[PDB]
What we know:
The complex is a heterodimer.
Chain A: E1 17-21, E2 27-32, E3 38-43, E4 45-50, E5 56-62, H1 73-91, E6 100-103, H2 109-115, E7 123-125, H3 140-148, E8 153-158, H4 169-185, H5 187-195, H6 213-235
Parallel strand pairs in A: 1-6, 6-7
Antiparallel strand pairs in A: 1-4, 2-3, 4-5, 5-8
Helix pairs in contact in A: 1-2, 4-5, 4-6, 5-6
Chain B: E1 2-5, E2 13-17, E3 20-24, E4 32-36, E5 42-48, E6 55-60, E7 67-72, E8 77-82, H1 86-98, E9 103-104, H2 113-118, H3 123-129, E10 138-141, H4 147-150, H5 177-182, H6 185-197, H7 200-217, H8 220-234, H9 241-257, H10 263-266, H11 269-278, H12 286-295
Parallel strand pairs in B: 4-9
Antiparallel strand pairs in B: 1-4, 2-3, 2-5, 5-6, 6-10, 7-8
The structure holds 4-[(methylamino)methyl]phenol.
Region (RNase H homology domain) (chain A): 7-237
Protein name (chain A): Pre-mRNA-splicing factor 8
Subcellular location (chain A): Nucleus
Amino acid sequence: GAMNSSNYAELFNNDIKLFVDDTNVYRVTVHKTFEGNVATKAINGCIFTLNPKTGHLFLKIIHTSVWAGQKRLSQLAKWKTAEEVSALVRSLPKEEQPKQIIVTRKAMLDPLEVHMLDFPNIAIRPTELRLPFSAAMSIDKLSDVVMKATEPQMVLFNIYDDWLDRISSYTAFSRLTLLLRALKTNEESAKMILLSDPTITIKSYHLWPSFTDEQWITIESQMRDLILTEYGRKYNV
Amino acid sequence: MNTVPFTSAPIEVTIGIDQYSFNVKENQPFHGIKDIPIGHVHVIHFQHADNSSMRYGYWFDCRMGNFYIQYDPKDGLYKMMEERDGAKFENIVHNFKERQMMVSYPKIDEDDTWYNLTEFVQMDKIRKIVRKDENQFSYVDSSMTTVQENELSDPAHSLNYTVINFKSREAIRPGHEMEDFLDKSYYLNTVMLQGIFKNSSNYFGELQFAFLNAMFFGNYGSSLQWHAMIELICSSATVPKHMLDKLDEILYYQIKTLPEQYSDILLNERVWNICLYSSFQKNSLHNTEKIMENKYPELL
Ligand SMILES: CNCc1ccc(O)cc1
């Protein structure tokens, strides 16, 4: 059934599962034409496919060429997402294929269900969580590889860097969701918090700064404060 | 004009014949139904006064044999049986008519309702959906499950409707996932019409039989089958114009005949709203859309 606050620990068990977020697949700028009409211009997008236990991120880059001469692009985007997740699964050895795929948006259920018809043993699940994976394009290195892409490309990352050496998957996911929530609510403030102290760098092979255990606690506190402040302003509470 | 005699009516029962019904009292001298139009299938159906859970009946065609009803006090139901002795049967029928113990099939000359509901229904196809080859007539009741319902327990007593599943290998060509799911023309025209039904008459005959089983017996799986067969046409961009015109007529008479008080359990909001307002065929069911808007504006 639906993934929710109650059944949260299931993410961190030994059943392989993937989250699929399609928010950043079809991305546009809205602009005026010469005649004063409005037009969209597509920009490169990505499928965010994440193993929440391992941190393995399958970033499928969606090049604007995909949309050329197609109609109803917001609908096609859901099917293109399902097609690419389907191709990813079939590329993985049997023992690495997921037992569940959890979609962050219910509109992805039917497309993925039809694309995975011949995988009757893979459960396609919605979630009641409002996960902040839309904010993935606020991670500089992920934004950089999407916007530089000249063709369809799959890039593999570990979104937890080396955290699993020191913390559990549960803790790593909670830190990831806190960072992304902060980046979604106030990108400028979140980024200032992460990159202020210039002596803490991002390793070439990492996405996030090389914080010590104590420094992560300070960062996490600063992210939580940021999120509640913006909640205050938002609701005049 | 044919006759279905009854041995007797030992238990109080509401008897249906097609869209007509009459109440018979316990041990009322009732010996059957005469003046039944030749040329159509018919359904005789029963609801006991004591137990309205006993909703059950028999599809038959008078051209296939001499059929009568007899109450079985062991199994506690009115059973259909065939009389192979033509002379004993003519004899019995003549005597009950002479004694005027039979009700007349109460058809109005102008009234084409039953023809319109059964246009494509044929006894040979009914007997493939309801499997009991020793009898020429087919028993259906409220509780019987469909083969599809049984996949998601007794196969002898099931309704063998053609399985329709929009999210299945049969429905979707590999590489045409989005195309085939949003436009079901492939599934309708190649898989179902050309592959399984062979023609639109067989397809319509199953759709009409499913409807009638839903209406007369409140058979839930039949209702599912009726909606699925409608939805598969409405969800197809490419449907022969003669099929659209005939479907409009079929559905018009079904909606006209449906008892007003049953529209809430017998009509699926989603399918009808999608067929009349969202689907490729939203503008192709003029008669159906007008009667639905005038008779069930609430559902929509
Ligand atoms: C290959 N995508 C799923 C699928 C869809 C339909 C089909 O007959 C087999 C597999």
